[PDB]
Ligand binder design. Structure first.
Ligand SMILES: O=S([O-])[O-]
Lengths: 92, 107, 51
DNA sequence: TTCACGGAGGCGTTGATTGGTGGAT
DNA sequence: AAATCCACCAATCAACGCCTCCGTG
């Protein structure tokens, strides 16, 4: 376990922030670091909820449906229902 | 054009692009292996299906975008064109959906 | 007050993070890439260019 | 016994990491 | 006035995606 694996790469995060803003807009290094920490916790927060349900049902694999179910439980229902459409298309 | 009006229809535009786009699961803004390593940092997690990182790549794209747009509104209100950490902190306080980040972004 | 749907998971993550820091920003991540960037030919404006 | 599927490890890429300066603020 | 700090640039190498092989259920 490398300590730096808790976080997504900052350049990839920074690029998505850039595309979400006007062309003239600039982003402070602290805003990029803050966003990196927030989106990394988003993954861990949702994965932990999915993980505990997988363990309770004695399933070894966290699957796509577990992530969606965890997103609904934790009140990310826009994300759960949007990614459900995305998933069905990926399997279509 | 207004930062608020773009945010108020944000999910309509997400659903339009989901329902009518040439999704290339080939290309992702976020590397899948790194998403998987964040998941595996939790000792409770054993195995992960190939679909779970793919969902997180798209989910995290949407999440970074929504939060950046909410934060940009605060930057616009203070007549600044640089996005600051304080703009993200201000955005997090406006929705209880972000309560999970209370320890990541204190006060 | 706290999101009722997130309350329990927030505290599990706090304990898990407190445990993770126990068993583990630098100016840069890698010494080699740090040295590459300190070595390369720079333009007058401080930008890198093709070798 | 075969089928479905995800980890481990090897291979061929491959774009994230990186800092000095101008000028915006 | 004088200081702070982010976009700009592209080549190396840490690591990403894909593959094959094997273990599990
Ligand atoms: O109330 S929760 O933020 O600990």
């Amino acid at each position: 376990m490398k300590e730096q694996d808790r976080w997504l790469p900052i350049a990839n995060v920074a690029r998505i922030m850039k595309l979400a803003l006007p062309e003239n807009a600039k982003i402070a290094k602290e805003a990029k670091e803050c966003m990196q920490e927030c989106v990394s916790e988003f993954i861990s927060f949702i994965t932990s909820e999915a993980s505990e349900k997988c363990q309770q049902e004695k399933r070894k694999t966290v699957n796509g449906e577990d992530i969606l179910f965890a997103m609904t439980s934790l009140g990310f229902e826009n994300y759960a229902e949007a990614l459900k459409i995305y998933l069905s298309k990926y399997r279509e | 054009g207004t930062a608020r009006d773009i945010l108020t229809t944000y999910w309509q535009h997400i659903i339009n692009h989901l329902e009518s786009d040439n999704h290339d699961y080939k290309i992702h803004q976020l590397p899948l292996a790194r998403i998987k390593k964040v998941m595996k940092a939790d000792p409770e997690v054993k195995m992960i299906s190939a679909e779970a990182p793919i969902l997180f790549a798209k989910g995290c794209d949407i999440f970074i975008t929504e939060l950046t747009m909410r934060a940009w509104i605060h930057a616009e209100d203070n007549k600044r064109r640089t996005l600051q950490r304080s703009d993200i902190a201000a955005a997090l306080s406006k929705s209880d959906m972000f309560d999970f980040l209370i320890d990541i972004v204190p006060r | 007050y706290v999101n009722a749907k997130q309350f329990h998971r927030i505290l599990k993550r706090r304990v898990a993070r407190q445990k993770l820091e126990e068993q583990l920003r630098k100016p840069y991540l890698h010494e080699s890439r740090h040295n590459h960037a300190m070595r390369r030919p720079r333009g007058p404006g401080g930008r890198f260019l093709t070798a």
